């Protein structure tokens, strides 16, 4: 285990005897993480990195049917719970009963607006985040029933009701604006094949103005580079076939710096703390930049690994981001939730699966049963789900005018 290795101690924070709120809080995290690593080197047994599959399963098992009033805060994000949970099972290679599926579908039909798009729950206004979530859900189920739930013609009509002159999109009518919308839009429009010639006109340029002096991308022009928005940014472009509107080199140098040399996982932004969900938002950029660079015949790219320490990420996840009772999480001490369960797994998958044309090299830490199904680094659903959905919707024609 890379993290338990002796010299690894040396990758411990050096505050330079000049402490600020930052160095202090960073110190605390490492402190707790260390205790986790040293838990094994505690006059007992051999460290067994095991993915508590059976437990994450049961967790996800009910979550798909009911939630305690503890989730009243996600009452406007139900399409996500479907996606998050119904995607975690995917990665665990668990099956989605042909009955529960129809339920998910019927439910989403209730969340969908007669004005295109989906709301956070039955009868809520359409909002791109829920829309994104709803669509991946449906594609993960990949049945013509699921597909038919989506109203292609009004979904596009929705995308325009939100598109802005400067290229950006609103998250919803009278709502806010940031790269999340570009991604959500490009994610649904592309899968459902409704991309007109002027839908995303000027978006690649707007997205590009979000990349700042850090190399990463911010929510909006002028803001600090952040993993969550950086994914939405790059991913959106990859869909628009415009990775090159960005300075891919500064970006690469940025994302790579985002991985914590000690914890092993990533931070959403420079001098910020580690966090399990970023195993996908940050680490996910690598599979994406590998494509972009490679499509430019970059000769220095690797024939087997992504450009981050895949092992360290898997150790962080397995040893630090997993709750005994089930479900994954932010970091130790924090609570479990379907969000982190959905992204610590997706992240795990990416770090254990490598692609690049003829190249296929997996790296599974711990017991080989820790292998998850692969996830498409753009839509973050099954490569096959993506492929299947895309080909299926191209049988249909883009809402012609």
């Amino acid at each position: 285990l890379y993290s338990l290795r002796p010299e690894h101690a040396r990758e411990r924070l050096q505050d330079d005897s000049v402490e600020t709120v930052t160095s202090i809080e960073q110190a605390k995290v490492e402190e707790k993480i260390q205790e986790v690593f040293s838990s094994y080197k505690f006059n007992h047994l051999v460290p067994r990195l095991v993915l508590q599959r059976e437990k994450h399963f049961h967790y996800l098992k009910r979550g798909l049917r009911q939630l305690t009033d503890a989730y009243e805060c996600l009452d406007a994000s139900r399409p996500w719970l479907c996606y998050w949970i119904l995607h975690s099972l995917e990665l665990l290679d668990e099956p989605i009963p042909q009955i529960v599926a129809t339920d998910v579908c019927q439910f989403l039909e209730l969340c969908q607006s007669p004005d295109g798009g989906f709301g956070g729950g039955p009868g809520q206004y359409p909002h791109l985040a829920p829309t994104y979530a709803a669509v991946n859900a449906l594609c993960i189920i990949g049945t013509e029933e699921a597909y038919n739930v989506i109203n292609r013609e009004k979904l596009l009509q929705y995308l325009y009701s939100l598109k802005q002159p400067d290229g950006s999109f609103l998250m919803h009518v009278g709502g806010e604006v940031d790269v999340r919308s570009a991604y959500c839009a490009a994610s649904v429009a592309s899968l459902t094949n409704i991309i007109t010639p002027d839908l995303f006109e000027g978006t690649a340029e707007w997205i590009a103005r979000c990349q700042n002096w850090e190399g990463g991308i911010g929510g909006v022009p002028g803001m600090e580079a952040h993993g969550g928005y950086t994914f939405c940014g790059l991913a959106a472009l990859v869909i628009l076939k415009k990775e090159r509107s960005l300075n891919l080199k500064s970006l690469l140098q940025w994302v790579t710096s985002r991985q914590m040399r000690f914890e092993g996982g990533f931070q959403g932004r420079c001098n910020k703390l580690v966090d399990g969900c970023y195993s996908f938002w940050q680490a996910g950029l690598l599979p994406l930049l590998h494509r972009a660079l490679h499509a430019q015949g970059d000769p220095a790219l690797s024939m087997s690994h992504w450009m981050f320490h895949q092992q360290a990420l898997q150790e962080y996840i397995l040893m630090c981001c997993q709750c005994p009772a089930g479900g994954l999480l932010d970091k130790p001490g924090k609570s479990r939730d379907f969000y982190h369960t959905c992204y610590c797994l997706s992240g795990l998958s990416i770090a254990q699966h490598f692609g690049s044309g003829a190249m296929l090299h997996d790296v599974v830490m711990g017991v080989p049963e820790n292998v998850l199904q692969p996830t498409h680094p753009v839509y973050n659903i099954g490569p096959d789900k993506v492929i299947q959905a895309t080909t299926h919707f191209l049988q249909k024609p883009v809402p012609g005018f």
């Binding site: 990758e11 505050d15 330079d16 000049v18 600020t20 709120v21 930052t22 798909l64 049917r65 009911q66 939630l67 305690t68 009033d69 009243e72 805060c73 996600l74 009452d75 406007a76 139900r78 479907c82 129809t102 339920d103 998910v104 019927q106 439910f107 209730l110 709301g119 956070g120 039955p122 009868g123 206004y125 909002h127 919803h172 009518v173 709502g175 806010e176 700042n212 002096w213 850090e214 929510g219 909006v220 002028g222 803001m223 600090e224 690469l252 140098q253 790579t256 710096s257 914590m260 040399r261 420079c270 001098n271 910020k272 000769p299 220095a300 690994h305 992504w306 450009m307 320490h309 360290a312």
Partner: protein, 313 residues
């Protein structure tokens, strides 16, 4: 007249007289519920009535007060905020009071998109930004890195075009925590839109300043990302003293950041036809290998990609 959801004398809407004329509307999750939420009964109650009011689009004062509770039970329900902000228009509510409200709400839960976007709207309607920089500063005083606070702050500064005192605020915070990367960003935001980094007088100040901050906290990655950020656009190779400057730090102020900034310098020199293209390279390839094997291993794939790139130019 509001009766607090926290008040010990709070009564569910189904037990209120002013709301008997209306039948609440239970949410419809269908016959075979999924990710169904078992609501408390205060919450179920508030929303069954929100659905009612929203249903018949009742733009009344009681509906207005109801959105308050609906919001307090789930500040992230954007439909409620939308409808509420529809009542501000119909009922022509005193929007300066609405500010007081959204101010309380933000204070108590600042990492919510709806709350800030709602403030933004009021500010636009009132076209009044007089109390924004202060409000934002109070939030940022509780969380010097709240991403929403800064994004909202830039928005205000650039719209109402209130730059004059922001760089001063930036020095304030960097002094409170030189590692607050949100502040360094804010600093670059302020300058990029005010003077820019062309005026040698400014580039000088900044670079001098940054090197100083680097000297104090050698392992502060923000200062470095900033130092490279303000020079990377013109090319670090056009500042011959820079390289020197840094190498002096090798012993007394070493960090794998210094090591990596050097690689960036060497990188840019081969790009700009420097001289000793043989020499400089090995020196660059050496460092990349050191970073990969010892100094910064978490990213050996990256530093090994670098030798490999500079290996072909």
């Amino acid at each position: 007249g509001f009766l607090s959801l926290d008040s010990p004398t709070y009564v569910l809407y189904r037990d209120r007289a002013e709301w008997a004329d209306i039948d609440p509307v239970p949410q419809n999750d269908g016959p075979s519920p999924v990710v169904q939420i078992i609501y408390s009964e205060k919450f179920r109650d508030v929303y069954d009535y929100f659905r009612a009011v929203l249903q018949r689009d009742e733009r009344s004062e009681r509906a207005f007060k109801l959105t308050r509770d609906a919001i307090e039970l789930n500040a992230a329900n954007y439909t409620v905020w939308h409808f509420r902000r529809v009542l501000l228009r119909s009922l022509q509510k005193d929007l300066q009071e609405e500010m007081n409200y959204i101010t309380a709400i933000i204070e108590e839960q600042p990492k919510n998109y709806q709350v800030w976007h709602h403030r933004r709207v009021l500010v636009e309607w009132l076209k009044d930004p007089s109390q924004e920089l202060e409000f934002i500063a109070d939030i940022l005083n509780q969380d010097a890195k709240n991403y929403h606070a800064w994004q909202h702050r830039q928005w205000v500064i650039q719209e109402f075009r209130l730059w004059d005192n922001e760089l001063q605020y930036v020095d304030q915070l960097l002094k409170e925590d030189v590692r607050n990367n949100s502040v360094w960003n804010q600093r670059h935001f302020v300058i990029s839109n005010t003077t820019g980094y062309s005026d040698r007088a400014v580039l000088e100040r900044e670079v001098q300043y940054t090197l100083e901050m680097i000297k104090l906290v050698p392992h502060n990655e923000s200062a470095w990302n900033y130092l490279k950020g303000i020079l990377q656009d013109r090319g670090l190779s056009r500042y011959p003293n820079l390289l020197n400057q840094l190498l002096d730090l090798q012993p007394s102020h070493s960090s794998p950041y210094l090591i990596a900034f050097l690689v960036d310098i060497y990188e840019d020199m081969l790009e700009n036809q420097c001289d000793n293209k043989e020499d400089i390279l090995n020196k660059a390839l050496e460092l990349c290998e050191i970073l990969a094997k010892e100094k910064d291993t978490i990213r050996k794939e990256y530093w090994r990609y670098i030798g490999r790139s500079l290996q072909s130019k």
